[PDB]
Amino acid sequence: MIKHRPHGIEHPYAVSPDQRVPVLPLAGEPVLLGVVAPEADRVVCEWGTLELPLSATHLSEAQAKSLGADGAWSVQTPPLAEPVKYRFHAHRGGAAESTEWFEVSPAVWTADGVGEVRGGGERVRGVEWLVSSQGVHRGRFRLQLQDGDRLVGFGERYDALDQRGRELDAVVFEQYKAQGVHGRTYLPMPFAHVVGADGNGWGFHVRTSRRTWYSSAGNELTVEVALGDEPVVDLAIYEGDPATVLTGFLDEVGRAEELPGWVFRLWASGNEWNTQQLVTARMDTHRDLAIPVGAVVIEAWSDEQGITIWRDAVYAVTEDGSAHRAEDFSYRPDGAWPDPKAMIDELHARGIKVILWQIPLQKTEFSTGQVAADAAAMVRDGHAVLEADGTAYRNRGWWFPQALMPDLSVQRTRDWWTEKRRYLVEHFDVDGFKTAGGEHAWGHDLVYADGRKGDEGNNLYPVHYARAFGDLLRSAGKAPVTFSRAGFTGSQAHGIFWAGDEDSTWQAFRSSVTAGLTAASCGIVYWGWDLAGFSGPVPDAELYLRAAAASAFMPIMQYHSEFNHHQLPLRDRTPWHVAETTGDDRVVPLFRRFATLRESLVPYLTEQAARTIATDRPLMRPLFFDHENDPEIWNHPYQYLLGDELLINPVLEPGATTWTTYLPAGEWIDVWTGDRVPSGLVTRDVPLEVVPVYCRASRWSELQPVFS
Numbered sequence: 041m042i043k044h045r046p047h048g049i050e051h052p053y054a055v056s057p058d059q060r061v062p063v064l065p066l067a068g069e070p071v072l073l074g075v076v077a078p079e080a081d082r083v084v085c086e087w088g089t090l091e092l093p094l095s096a097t098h099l100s101e102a103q104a105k106s107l108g109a110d111g112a113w114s115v116q117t118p119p120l121a122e123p124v125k126y127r128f129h130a131h132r133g134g135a136a137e138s139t140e141w142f143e144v145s146p147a148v149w150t151a152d153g154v155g156e157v158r159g160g161g162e163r164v165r166g167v168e169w170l171v172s173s174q175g176v177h178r179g180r181f182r183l184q185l186q187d188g189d190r191l192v193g194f195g196e197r198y199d200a201l202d203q204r205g206r207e208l209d210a211v212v213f214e215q216y217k218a219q220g221v222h223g224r225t226y227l228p229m230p231f232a233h234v235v236g237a238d239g240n241g242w243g244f245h246v247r248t249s250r251r252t253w254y255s256s257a258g259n260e261l262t263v264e265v266a267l268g269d270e271p272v273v274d275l276a277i278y279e280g281d282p283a284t285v286l287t288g289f290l291d292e293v294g295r296a297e298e299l300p301g302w303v304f305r306l307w308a309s310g311n312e313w314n315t316q317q318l319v320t321a322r323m324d325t326h327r328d329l330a331i332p333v334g335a336v337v338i339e340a341w342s343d344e345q346g347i348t349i350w351r352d353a354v355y356a357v358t359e360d361g362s363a364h365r366a367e368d369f370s371y372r373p374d375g376a377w378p379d380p381k382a383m384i385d386e387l388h389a390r391g392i393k394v395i396l397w398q399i400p401l402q403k404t405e406f407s408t409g410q411v412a413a414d415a416a417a418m419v420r421d422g423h424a425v426l427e428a429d430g431t432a433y434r435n436r437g438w439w440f441p442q443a444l445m446p447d448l449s450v451q452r453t454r455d456w457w458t459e460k461r462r463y464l465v466e467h468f469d470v471d472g473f474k475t476a477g478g479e480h481a482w483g484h485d486l487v488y489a490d491g492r493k494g495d496e497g498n499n500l501y502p503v504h505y506a507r508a509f510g511d512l513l514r515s516a517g518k519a520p521v522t523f524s525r526a527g528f529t530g531s532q533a534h535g536i537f538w539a540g541d542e543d544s545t546w547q548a549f550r551s552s553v554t555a556g557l558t559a560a561s562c563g564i565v566y567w568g569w570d571l572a573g574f575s576g577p578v579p580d581a582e583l584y585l586r587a588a589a590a591s592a593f594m595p596i597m598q599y600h601s602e603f604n605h606h607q608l609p610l611r612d613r614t615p616w617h618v619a620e621t622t623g624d625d626r627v628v629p630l631f632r633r634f635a636t637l638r639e640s641l642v643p644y645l646t647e648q649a650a651r652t653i654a655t656d657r658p659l660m661r662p663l664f665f666d667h668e669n670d671p672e673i674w675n676h677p678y679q680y681l682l683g684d685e686l687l688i689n690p691v692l693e694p695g696a697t698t699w700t701t702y703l704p705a706g707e708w709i710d711v712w713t714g715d716r717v718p719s720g721l722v723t724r725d726v727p728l729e730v731v732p733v734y735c736r737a738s739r740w741s742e743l744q745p746v747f748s
């Protein structure tokens with residue numbers, strides 16, 4: 041047997057051993073041809089009129105092996121001067137087999153074409169098109185920049201606030217940690233601020249959900265756009281100060297709505313709280329240690345099959361794949377969740393909201409049960425995202441492999457899919473969903489029921505996903521509180537976002553701050569991260585407290601911990617476990633101090649979030665919004681305003697006993713001493729109980745009780 045897929049697995053940053061590299065070669069380029077034939081004596085390619093012998097040949101070694109890296113054949117062809125038809129022939133001991141015919145057409149960049157780039161006015165130059173015998177594959181063009189212009193935007197970015205001088209793209213991808221290092225993201229947008237030095241600033245939005253690439257050198261920003269059947273790039277330009285630029289974007293693509301004030305309290309989470317006993321014990325420790333928590337996320341709450349039913353719940357399976365009613369279920373005394381309603385009711389009585397984990401995937405690896413019935417129903421009734429051949433798409437990723445994706449691009453399947461979760465909101469009264477994932481769709485030719493194809497619709501999927509569960513909550517009369525890592529243009533209007541998975545490191549800390557700042561610049565209001573990281577060994581006391589202090593001054597303050605296989609010792613990120621692991625007796629008292637202060641901040645946050653939604657001036661706010669003509673601000677990219685009145689300067693290095701903050705124009709006050717401070721550089725002591733925070737002098741009469 042022998043297999044060749046020209047596009048391969050269609051990992052956006054990597055190639056599989058079975059594919060053609062590159063998929064679309066430029067004229068003059070050679071092409072590499074991979075093939076997987078685990079047992080064959082010899083493998084040859086019939087290439088045009090020639091015959092090309094294959095040898096035995098960014099994926100990891102574990103991932104590549106699963107795709108057949110062992111027993112993979114490859115050969116580099118002659119350069120592509122024209123379209124070539126080709127196939128492969130493999131022999132095992134005289135037994136012969138041949139692949140279907142494939143064809144590749146080389147492409148060229150040209151300024152000649154019927155294609156238009158519309159809307160850029162006189163800012164656009166150097167328009168060109170990537171064309172082959174198949175058609176126009178990509179547009180490309182240049183935006184004029186001036187000296188001192190910064191590029192801030194592109195959704196949530198982990199490497200730097202200013203993207204000028206960098207190569208990057210916008211595509212939804214799950215990068216498992218180290219997002220800043222690889223320069224990737226779960227939440228890209230083809231939008232950015234061009235932040236003026238000197239004169240009036242502006243911004244742009246490339247209107248597409250397809251892939252876009254970006255690079256800047258000298259005075260030009262180069263924008264490359266993937267295309268569909270129509271060779272047209274629609275470009276929107278927004279003129280004004282940074283807030284006004286954001287307004288133009290958000291007026292076009294959507295905007296946050298006010299969420300309930302309780303989302304501004306501390307969120308407690310850990311993945312290994314997989315029983316009612318554990319959740320209640322963890323929240324009890326919160327109560328007993330007097331550490332206020334406003335919400336608890338339960339990730340492993342479910343049967344781990346369909347992920348819409350409590351673990352060890354007893355019910356009659358519905359063969360038709362219809363949704364369950366609350367009364368369908370029984371909960372046994374000896375099960376993992378003997379009385380989930382009683383648990384939630386008690387939590388609610390304590391003022392704690394309850395959030396359940398979600399994934400937009402239906403496991404196919406079971407032949408029985410509700411999970412199998414629903415999977416069969418998805419295919420039968422057309423609720424699944426489809427391949428080009430009409431079969432159901434199966435997850436090509438390594439996380440939840442082969443699972444189906446519900447097609448959330450249309451209302452009927454959004455209804456059908458969320459209907460399975462309805463009893464959770466209406467009976468059990470859960471207050472939100474942590475809607476994880478959504479990046480799972482890989483293929484250019486995938487078909488969505490809304491008429492979009494994969495190259496267009498795959499980036500849109502996480503937006504549909506958050507909206508689906510936001511709508512479920514609305515339909516139950518509750519605020520649309522969803523908690524999502526993934527998104528795209530339009531995500532601004534659905535729920536809360538966190539920065540995804542990272543190790544516990546100072547680098548990840550710094551990356552996360554950048555992620556929040558860039559996200560806010562694009563209109564993402566309610567944002568957080570897993571403070572001091574959720575993955576690997578427990579953070580040390582210093583990193584934990586530096587992160588905890590700063591996060592209390594961020595839109596969403598939440599701690600979380602990755603699945604450890606239920607080993608001992610625990611990897612929990614709870615304050616008392618950190619104290620336990622580090623042996624540091626300052627962790628619980630100082631975290632309690634931060635959490636207690638955070639509670640006092642809720643009315644301020646609530647008011648500021650309302651201003652942010654009305655004026656589009658960001659909640660976690662880079663200084664260029666108010667201060668754009670101040671050149672000095674760019675030397676302190678980790679500083680920000682929290683709402684109008686508070687400037688925050690996180691301590692991002694270990695061992696720091698002092699910290700220096702740049703205060704822009706206006707009068708300021710040190711919130712810890714109540715003293716007045718002159719604008720410009722300011723240095724103050726930073727013991728672990730302090731993160732530098734300054735208040736506009738005119739409103740310190742309002743903020744003073746908070747810090748008293």
Ligand SMILES: OC[C@H]1O[C@H](OC[C@H]2O[C@H](O)[C@H](O)[C@@H](O)[C@@H]2O)[C@H](O)[C@@H](O)[C@@H]1O
Pocket residue numbers: 311339340341344397476477525540541600601602603
């Ligand atoms: O038991 C529920 C769930 O736990 C893990 O998923 C948790 C993980 O989900 C995403 O990676 C989020 O970004 C993280 O914050 C969460 O900790 C397991 O991997 C999964 O199989 C399981 O169903």
